[PDB]
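S.,

As promised, the 2-phosphoglyceric acid run. Input:
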Amino acid sequence: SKPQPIAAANWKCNGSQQSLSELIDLFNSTSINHDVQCVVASTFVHLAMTKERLSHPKFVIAAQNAIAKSGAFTGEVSLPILKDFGVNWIVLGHSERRAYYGETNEIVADKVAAAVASGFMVIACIGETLQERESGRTAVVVLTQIAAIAKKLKKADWAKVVIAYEPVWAIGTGKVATPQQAQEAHALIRSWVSSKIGADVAGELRILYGGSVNGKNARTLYQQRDVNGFLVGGASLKPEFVDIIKATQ
Amino acid sequence: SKPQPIAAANWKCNGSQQSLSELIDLFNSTSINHDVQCVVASTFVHLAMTKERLSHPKFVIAAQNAIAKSGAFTGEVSLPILKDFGVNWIVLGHSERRAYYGETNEIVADKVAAAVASGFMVIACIGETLQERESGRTAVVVLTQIAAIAKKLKKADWAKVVIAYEPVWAIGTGKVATPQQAQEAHALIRSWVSSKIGADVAGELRILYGGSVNGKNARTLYQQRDVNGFLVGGASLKPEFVDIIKATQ
Ligand SMILES: O=C(O)[C@H](CO)OP(=O)(O)O
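Predicted complex:
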C-alpha cells in the first residue's frame, strides 16, 4: 500500500515552442486509467504555452524554481508572481541548483517554507554526492537535508510536501544505481519522517526517485516499497515518458 | 550629435498580470515623437503577456537574465530558448546578480559574448559599491569591469552593446548620483572605449545611467554629454516612466 503516485517531468533548461507543443500533444493523447498525478515542470518562458496547451486532466504544471518575495531581484521569479499566474506546483532544491547556484540546505528550507505557506505543492529535492557516499556519509547528508526542511514546517504542512531523492553520486559519474540502493535511501527518509514527525505523515508521504529513469527500468523501480513515483530528467523530453507514467500502476 | 538614446524599464522581480497590463495600456497610449528606443524588461513569466500586449512601435521587450546554453540547468533560461521565443534584447550583469547570485566579471563577460554571438542586443551593467566609492576605487572598479567584457568581444560586436552605469549606492535608495558624478563616470567609460577600441565606436556607444532616476531628476541627468539614457527600476512600475521617456533625445 502506497499513496497516490507522481510522475514528474523536469524539462530543465530545454525546449522550443515547436518541440514542446508536440510533446504536449502526445501527452494529451495519453490514456491513463490509474490514480496518478502527472506533473510538467517547464522553463518560466514556456509556462504560458504549457498552461494553454495542456488539457489532460491528470497533468498539472510546475515551475523549476522560485524566490520567496517579489522585489529587486533582477532575473529571478517569485512565489507571488507564480501564484498570480496560476502555477501551484514547484520544484525546489534541485541538485543542479545546489551545485551551481548557491543553494544551501538553509536556502532550500526557506524556499520550501515560503512556498508551503503560500499554498504550493512542493517537490523538494535532496540527495548525496559520490564523495559523500564514498566516505560513508549518505545517512548524515540525507537526514541533514531533510531535517533542515523539517525545522521550518509544522505537521499540517507536510500534506503539501513531496520529497524527491536524487542519487547525485550516480549522475554524471560513471556509477549505476540499482533498485536496491534507491530503496535503501528511500526507506531511510521515510524512517526519519515516521520517527521525527509521525507515522501518519510518513505513510502518506510521496518519495520520488530522482535518478536515471527510462521506460525500461521504471517498473522495476516502482516495484520497490518506498518508491512513489519519479522526477524525470532526459526521458521527460521524450515519448518514453509515457511508459514512465504507466509504470506507476 | 548624441547616439540614439534608450529609456529602459527594468521591472525586476515584480508585478501582476493586471498591474502590468495597465502599464502596457498606458505605454501603448503614449505618443513619442522623438528618436528613442524604449525597452521593457519583464520577468520570464511575463514575457508572453508582454510580447502579446505591447504594441507601440518604439518599444522592445528584453529578458532580465539568461545562461548561455540549453541543458541540465534546472530553473535557468537559455539564450536559445529566448531567441526561439522572439526576444532580442537582454539585460546582463545587473548588480543584483553580481551581489547575490555569484556573477563575476568573468561570468558577466561570458554571458555578454554569448549573447552578442546569438545576435542579441545586450545592456551590460557595471557599477561600484558604496564601499568602493568611499575608498576612492571608482575608476578601478568601473574600468576593470568594462575591461572584462571587452576581452571577449570583437570590434564589430560593439554595435550590439549598451553600457549601463549603475552605482550600487544609488540602486533604489533615493541616492541619485549628481549630474556631475554621473557625467564623470560616463566620460571615464567612454575615454576607455576610444583609447582601447576606437573613437568611432566610442562616439556610437550608448551609456545609460541607472540609479534612483525619476521623472523630476531625469531631465538634468540627460543634459549631460556622456549620458545617453536610462535604466529605470522602481519608476518603471509607475506612469512616471513616461516623463522619463520624454526626458531624452
Ligand atoms: O535597474 C535598476 O537597478 C534600477 C536602476 O538601474 O534601480 P532603481 O529602482 O533605483 O531605479
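The pocket of 2-phosphoglyceric acid is lined by residues B 10, 166, 171-172, 210-213, 231-234 (CB under 6 Å). Residues 1-249 of chain A form a domain with the TIM Barrel fold (CATH 3.20.20.70).

- D.
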